[PDB]
Design a binder for this molecule. Structure first.
Ligand SMILES: Nc1ncnc2c1ncn2[C@@H]1O[C@H](COP(=O)(O)OP(=O)(O)O)[C@@H](O)[C@H]1O
Ligand SMILES: [Mg+2]
Length: 241
């Protein structure tokens, strides 16, 4: 019934460009990757090429665009925000950008799972001054890729995002990294992604082609655009091919 299913649907129903399309993972398109971090584990796979194309699009499709950071978000849970964010981050690092991925989903974080990292310190603890900057950001075994995990689950993420601590951190991150990617919770349920979007001014919108309602997806788009941020485009995920 009501799915945004493909590129035509994105153009016609949402009026956005498609930055890339990510197929549902299989043995062939991931070359039997052991994890969902395809770009790292199988850098020559078809899927890995798609993420490189997304990277090239963001950085080179628009002449004298100067994108320093992006929010990765979606309308609903399970769209593939975390997976797209992590793989895109690796793609940036491989290309030689000093890259940070920030786990800004302080409600249901998964970047520590994806990158196999401890989550005792991270974004929440840093913002609460429980941990230091240098202790909270992890340099991964992937060269040019750092990760700021979510940290412990805080009582009120909104309070942290709107704190002067975060505004000041964000400024510091822009000065320390060539590219910053912020993973977020879904738009329709909490305003976290909208708040982060006010900072980055640039948003990549992930749409699960397998399972979505067009009215819900459209509502999320409108909420993002209402922040004043530029919605760069859509990444279609779980595509049949
Ligand atoms: N293209 C894909 N093919 C198969 N599985 C995927 C794909 N994208 C994401 N997933 C899986 O779907 C689940 C939800 O993805 P996740 O990135 O956590 O979504 P979100 O952050 O939007 O909730 C994860 O287990 C992830 O490995
Ligand atoms: Mg997630």
């Amino acid at each position: 019934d009501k799915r945004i299913k493909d590129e035509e649907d994105v153009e016609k129903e949402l009026g956005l460009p498609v930055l890339g399309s990510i197929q549902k993972f299989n043995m062939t398109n991931t070359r039997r990757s052991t994890s969902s971090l395809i770009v790292h584990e199988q850098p020559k796979s078809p899927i890995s090429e798609k993420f490189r194309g997304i990277r090239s699009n963001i950085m080179f499709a628009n002449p004298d665009s100067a994108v320093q950071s992006i929010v990765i978000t979606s309308e609903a849970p399970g769209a593939g925000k975390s997976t797209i964010a992590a793989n895109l981050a690796v793609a940036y690092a491989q290309a030689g950008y000093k890259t940070l991925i920030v786990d800004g989903d302080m409600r249901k974080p998964t970047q520590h799972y994806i990158f196999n990292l401890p989550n005792n310190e991270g974004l929440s603890s840093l913002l609460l001054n429980w941990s230091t900057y240098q202790d909270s950001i992890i340099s991964t075994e992937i060269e040019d890729l750092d990760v700021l995990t979510s940290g412990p689950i805080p009582p009120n993420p909104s309070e942290l995002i709107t704190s002067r601590a975060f505004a000041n951190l964000y400024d510091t991150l822009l000065m320390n990294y060539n590219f910053v990617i912020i993973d977020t919770p879904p738009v329709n349920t909490v305003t976290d992604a909208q708040l982060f979007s006010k900072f980055t001014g640039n948003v990549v919108y992930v749409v699960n082609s397998e399972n979505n309602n067009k009215d819900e997806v459209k509502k999320g788009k409108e909420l993002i655009e209402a922040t004043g941020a530029k919605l760069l485009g859509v990444v279609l995920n779980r595509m049949p091919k």
